[PDB]
Design an enzyme around this catalytic site. Structure first.
Site, PDB file in Angstrom:
ATOM      1  N   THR A  22     -41.669  31.742  37.931  1.00 28.18           N
ATOM      2  CA  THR A  22     -43.197  32.062  37.327  1.00 28.18           C
ATOM      3  C   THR A  22     -44.103  32.684  38.195  1.00 28.18           C
ATOM      4  O   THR A  22     -44.088  32.224  39.455  1.00 28.18           O
ATOM      5  CB  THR A  22     -43.638  30.889  36.760  1.00 28.18           C
ATOM      6  N   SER A  60     -37.748  37.792  39.302  1.00 28.65           N
ATOM      7  CA  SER A  60     -36.201  37.632  39.327  1.00 28.65           C
ATOM      8  C   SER A  60     -36.081  36.359  39.006  1.00 28.65           C
ATOM      9  O   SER A  60     -35.122  36.104  38.097  1.00 28.65           O
ATOM     10  CB  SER A  60     -35.645  38.048  40.855  1.00 28.65           C
ATOM     11  N   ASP A  82     -31.637  41.896  46.785  1.00 29.64           N
ATOM     12  CA  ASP A  82     -31.957  42.038  45.601  1.00 29.64           C
ATOM     13  C   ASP A  82     -32.962  43.338  45.154  1.00 29.64           C
ATOM     14  O   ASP A  82     -33.642  43.065  44.386  1.00 29.64           O
ATOM     15  CB  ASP A  82     -32.559  40.694  44.887  1.00 29.64           C
TER      16      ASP A  82
END
Lengths: 235, 215, 225
Positions: free
Chosen positions: A30, A27, A129
């Site tokens: 890395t 999201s 999320d």
């Protein structure tokens, strides 16, 4: 055998875990592949605050049904380590490979998310999320716990704002196609599952069920072929 | 002699060449042999495997026609169907001629077979004047077996399981199957154990049978 | 008829009534070139028929070695009785290709035909023994050789049957000729060439290439024993 044929402490000192090839992004940031007594996952003031804030929320998880965090790194750069997940996100499985999931597993995907979030909620952990791009099917479908998927009021988080996202999971599980057009829902879906997906899209945020209720609901609905006696036993 | 046939049958069974088993087992039974559990088992397994694949094939074959050259699909169904009847009617004749006179577990299983093999035949149907014999066969076997072996015995439960599925699959009357199924569960759960390992699978199957019949 | 034959075949395929597939596709082949998809059905059909006819032979042969008795009579008689069935099946497909292969040159079609001809000889060679096997073994090596030549020159490494043909040639050398390096060199040459070709853009070649190539490394690996 014979030749086949054509069928037709949670701090890990630096240097102990080998962080290898870079795979992709999540999201934000890395994600890298790593090694330490098997495969491990490593996620790489503002930087420190973002790390401690994300690490601190992630640092509260100790369960088999959540992507397993393993440690963090400060050298050569700040890194967050979790176990490695092999496969693709629910989005990739559903939308680029058209993954063929069993109905029991589709219902089970809902069951594991409520169990994990309930556990998280027992630890006061807000997900904030949930989405198919963030849901990895670990090994044999083992569940490990957004602009288009962030609820209207969220897109301010609360138990019901997180639930909305699971409602979208019901939609994705039953329709399998990119937006969402609910008409894509499968024909053999049990009516109780069909209704819950419809219920999840209800306009009142506070009307969403609690995680204890969902898990209990999944346990009840989960019960929903007969055939002839198998051949008698022989060594 | 039969020992030679028993060996050949044992061979064809594991080598996935079931057609030879039936013919060889037929020679043993037509001679008038008396079959023990393992002796009859081989026979039971031979014909059950042989008939299931064709019937499952018919299920496949008979489903494509629903999607409706057109005549050819139906004609192919009639061929496997025609063959499916013949290949089983042979067993009914053998059962009726030799296995019926065979003479209590022996009669129970053979009577069980009559209804079982009759079920596989009648379901292919005419049907109105056919299915009752399997009903008769199952009722007699169940009624006679009820006094000879305890519910924990897998033959009785296997008999009861088929007897239960029979009403559901023959005429769709779940009321007797579900009641029949649960009727055996508690006396089986209450408990000879050498084959109980097998009994638990049938028990689980009936409970799983019960699980679908809830709807 | 042909449409219906294909239909009976395609339907019987669904029925897995491969026994019937043999009769239908043989009769289909008897009409005399076989189209691509129509050709594919025959290969899978007889392969499935031979498969049952081979797996049984394998277990019973092992059982015979294990058998050491009256069993020797039953086992040997049974093995012989299954062998004569497959050989007739073998001579049948051989007779069909011997007749209808000739109408072929579309070089890959000819290539496809020779590959098919060589494969069954190996099945025949496994059940045979001594000089009987020698006669067929000779024809088998020659068939693969002639197939390898035309396939090598006329078919690019992206062609799946070219790779599968090399695989069949190599497995025969390894299993009967017992020269792993002779098989490994050719098979790895295709493998090395095929992995270089993996860079090609076509999806179907790519799909079929990755599907087949997986067998190559563990096969060679298994051949290290």
């Amino acid at each position: 055998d014979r030749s086949s044929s054509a069928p037709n402490d949670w701090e890990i000192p630096d240097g102990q875990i080998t962080v290898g090839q870079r795979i992709g992004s999540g999201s934000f940031g890395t994600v890298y592949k790593g090694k330490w007594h098997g495969d491990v996952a490593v996620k790489m003031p503002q930087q420190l605050q973002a790390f401690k804030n994300e690490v601190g929320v992630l640092r509260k998880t100790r369960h088999v049904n959540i992507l397993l965090f393993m440690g963090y790194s400060t050298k050569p750069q700040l890194a967050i380590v979790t176990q490695w997940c092999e496969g693709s996100s629910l989005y990739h499985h559903l939308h680029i490979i058209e993954t063929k999931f069993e109905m029991i597993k589709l219902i089970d995907i809902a069951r594991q998310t409520a169990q994990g979030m309930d556990y998280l909620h027992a630890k006061s952990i807000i997900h904030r999320d949930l989405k198919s791009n963030n849901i990895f099917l670990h090994e044999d479908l083992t569940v490990k716990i957004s602009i288009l998927w962030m609820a209207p009021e969220v897109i301010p988080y609360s138990f019901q704002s997180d639930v909305y996202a699971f409602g979208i999971v019901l939609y994705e599980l039953m329709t399998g196609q990119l937006p969402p057009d609910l008409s894509k829902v499968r024909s053999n879906c049990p009516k109780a599952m069909k209704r819950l997906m419809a219920e999840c899209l209800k306009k009142k945020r506070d009307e969403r069920p609690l995680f204890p209720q969902i898990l209990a609901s999944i346990e009840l609905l989960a019960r929903s072929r007969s055939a002839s006696e198998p051949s008698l036993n022989r060594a | 002699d039969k020992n030679e046939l028993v060996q050949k049958a044992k061979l064809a069974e594991q080598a996935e060449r079931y057609d030879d088993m039936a013919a060889c087992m037929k020679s043993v039974t037509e001679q008038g042999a008396e079959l023990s559990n393992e002796e009859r088992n081989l026979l039971s397994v031979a014909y059950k495997n042989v008939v299931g694949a064709r019937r499952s094939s018919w299920r496949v074959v008979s489903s494509i026609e629903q999607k409706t050259k057109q005549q050819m699909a139906r004609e192919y169904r009639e061929k496997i169907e025609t063959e499916l009847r013949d290949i089983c009617n042979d067993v009914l004749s053998l059962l009726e001629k030799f296995l019926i006179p065979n003479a209590a577990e022996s009669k129970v299983f053979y009577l069980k077979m009559k209804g079982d093999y009759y079920r596989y035949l009648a379901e292919v149907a005419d049907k109105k004047g056919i299915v009752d014999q399997s009903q008769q066969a199952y009722q007699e076997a169940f009624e006679i077996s009820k006094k000879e072996m305890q519910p924990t015995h897998p033959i009785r439960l296997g008999l009861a399981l088929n007897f239960s599925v029979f009403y559901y699959e023959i005429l769709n009357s779940p009321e007797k199957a579900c009641s029949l199924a649960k009727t055996a569960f508690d006396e089986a759960i209450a408990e000879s154990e050498e084959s109980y390992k097998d009994s638990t699978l049938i028990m689980q199957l009936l409970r799983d049978n019960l699980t679908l019949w809830t709807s």
